[PDB]
Amino acid sequence: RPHIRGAIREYQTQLIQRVKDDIESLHDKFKVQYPQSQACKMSHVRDLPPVSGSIIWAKQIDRQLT
Amino acid sequence: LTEEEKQQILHSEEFLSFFDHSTRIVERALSEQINIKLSLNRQFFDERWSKHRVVSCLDWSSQYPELLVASYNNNEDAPHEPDGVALVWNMKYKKTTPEYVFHCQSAVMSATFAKFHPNLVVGGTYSGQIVLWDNRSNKRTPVQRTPLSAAAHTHPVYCVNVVGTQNAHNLISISTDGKICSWSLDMLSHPQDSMELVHKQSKAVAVTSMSFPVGDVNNFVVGSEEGSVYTACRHGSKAGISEMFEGHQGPITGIHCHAAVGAVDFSHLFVTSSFDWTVKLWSTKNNKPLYSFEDNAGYVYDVMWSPTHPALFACVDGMGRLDLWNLNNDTEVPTASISVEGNPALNRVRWTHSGREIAVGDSEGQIVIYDVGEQIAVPRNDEWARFGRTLAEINAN
Amino acid sequence: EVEETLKRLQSQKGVQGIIVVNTEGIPIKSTMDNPTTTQYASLMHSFILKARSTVRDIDPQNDLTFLRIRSKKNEIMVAPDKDYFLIVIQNPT
Amino acid sequence: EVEETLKRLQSQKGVQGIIVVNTEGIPIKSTMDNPTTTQYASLMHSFILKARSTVRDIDPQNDLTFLRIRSKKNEIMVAPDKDYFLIVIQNPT
Known part of the structure; x- marks a missing residue:
């Protein structure tokens, strides 16, 4: 509703900036390589691949993107 | 007063149970005393056995509650160390030391407890090798090891549990390919129901x-x-x-x-x-x-x-x-x-x-x-x- | 196994290691020097057998498997089986 | 604080007998019969004094402060002091 959208836009002025913070956090987490986190050792524990863990990791970041 | 024959008696296997009770009762005397929202109970950190030992799973003990198999997968940092480590810890005494150490020869993955057996530990590994850990002896090495054949335990078992109680305890080892092999609580020769699961396509379902x-x-x-x-x-x-x-x-x-x-x-x-x-x-x-x-x-x-x-x-x-x-x-x-x-x-x-x-x-x-x-x-x-x-x-x- | 046993027990609050006196009054295990803990463990076991006679004449079924002989400054704790006896000094901290 | 202290510590984790020693473990205050309280407290007194002599044989300037025997059927926690060689007959729980 536009009547409520007049206030929703005010909330959006904060929401969109926080989504920018979320996107930037995803940028930083994407720049964090897969062997940097312990996900390689944990992939070895749960018998998951490290390089496929990196690609499933990146596609999960793509899921947060979309 | 000499220690010639005394140290050679130490060299003998006569003190296996004696060293086990020495570990237990000195850990009974571990919390030194004098006479004159998360609560965070206790962090479990062994000195040698818990360092560069990635944890496998945390199985709980039915008999004697407040006990868990600190199953540790052998990380890449310790190849020379015995592949696969499992530990029990007295969660009440507040001891920084595990009650009994039980390493393995295969990379431990989801090691469990020998149900209704405080003197025995048994659980799967990376090879699916459910190995037996005897607690009556100080033999931290697996006294009995599961075969690693083709139709047998081959894949990493992330679920090795019985079905129900000790009535029809079917210690089914569910592996990363579906090689489901049942067992009992104590026999470790050949699995009870050695078989394999089937998927819609490409049966290698890495269960986790x-x-x-x-x-x-x-x-x-x-x-x-x-x-x-x-x-x-x-x-x-x-x-x-x-x-x-x-x-x-x-x-x-x-x-x-x-x-x-x-x-x-x-x-x-x-x-x-x-x-x-x-x-x-x-x-x-x-x-x-x-x-x-x-x-x-x-x-x-x-x-x-x-x-x-x-x-x-x-x-x-x-x-x-x-x-x-x-x-x-x-x-x-x-x-x-x-x-x-x-x-x-x-x-x-x-x-x-x-x-x-x-x-x-x-x-x-x-x-x-x-x-x-x-x-x-x-x-x-x-x-x-x-x-x-x-x-x-x-x-x- | 003696390495992990003595190491994990020595990892406590002041354990000087495992030193076990036998049922004769001879230190069957000694992670320390032979004369000092030999004489200490010998006199310890002689009066430990006296304390065994005491306690068994008092409590008829007390297996001496735990004994914290706390002195003015240390506790020569005895945490063995019934036959052998550990002789390890640790202050009551 | 005599009978209430008696029942107070006897109502703990199965304490079968506890009397703070008057001298040589024989007080009129008896938590049990004549042997278990009087005779056995006197035996623990003199023989814990022998344990003091044991540590004295190890270190003459080291008398005893406490004793702890928590085992299968008892938690004997004896504490020798300036006037009492404390007597404890207990249960494991």
């Missing part, structure tokens, strides 16, 4: 930290490496990896169902704290993500529902955060989404056999255990029923 729905029947959920969660058995022709629960976004790494219904509704549900990072709830007859939780930071690996309160859980992230959620009380917010020490990918989270205690399997070695007096069994059956109902409605509108 599964559970059983409330009732604890042979129906086991699948911690599949691709989402689209399945349920199967081993008994008879029910060994089919086909009841797909589509809607997930990643390899199911942490999946634990509804515990024994005591204060909430039945609700045969299982949450999936997996690689989707937004932990998804799922019923055993849903085929839709019943409820997607908070988008965690990094690779999520474990979850468990408390045996005290069979509806709440504790999911994780890939950046060391224990997100313990309340379900019949809250929907979009957890109770205490604490952050575990550092920022690693949390390996294991398994509630204590006594309940209301979160054992967070840390990075390597150490096991940070968060005690809680808040995740109690609140008598909310219709609330949890309507929770799973409404989200079982919102899952697909």
